């Protein structure tokens, strides 16, 4: 199934729309600060992307619902490496259906939606999600 098109700014303020990123894999993961498993997970998305944004996979980080100052505050906290991205009214988080948090859609070059994924994600696991959707090489 495509994976429903939005626009939404990154924390530097620019925009981002999703279509745009056809070609390359996208790890599309949706979170909130209070996720605990995130302050693990970010490190994890972190250390992989090093070597998987080279290979055409792109990670878009969207944070529901909290402000920027929050939002930058746990980027710095926890390594962020990566694009996040603020879905300010959780409209993209309700168009995509998303419940448990966090929750990722990898997308593969198609811009099709090729796997769901939600609960503990080692470093291991993420490593070959980032593969799964991975367009070269």
């Known amino acids: 199934s495509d994976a429903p098109n939005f626009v939404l700014e990154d ?3 620019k925009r981002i729309e999703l279509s745009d990123l056809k070609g390359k894999g996208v790890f599309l993961n949706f979170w909130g600060t209070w996720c605990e498993p995130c302050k693990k997970e970010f490190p994890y998305m972190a250390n992989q992307y090093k ?5 055409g996979v792109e990670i878009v980080a969207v944070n529901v619902g909290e402000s920027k100052i929050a ?3 746990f ?3 926890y ?3 990566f694009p996040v991205v603020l879905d300010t009214d959780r409209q993209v ?3 995509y259906d998303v419940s448990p948090l966090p929750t ?5 070059p198609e811009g ?10 080692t470093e291991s696991m993420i490593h070959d999600y980032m593969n799964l959707i991975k367009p070269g090489e």
Do not use: E, P, R, Y
């Open 112 to 121: 099709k939606v090729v796997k769901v994924v939600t609960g503990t994600m």
């Open 93 to 95: 988080l309700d168009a």
């Open 51 to 55: 070597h998987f944004k080279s290979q």
């Open 75 to 77: 980027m710095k906290s």
């Open 11 to 13: 924390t530097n303020g």
């Open 79 to 81: 390594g962020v490496n």
């Open 104 to 108: 990722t859609f990898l997308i593969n």
């Open 71 to 73: 939002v930058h505050n």
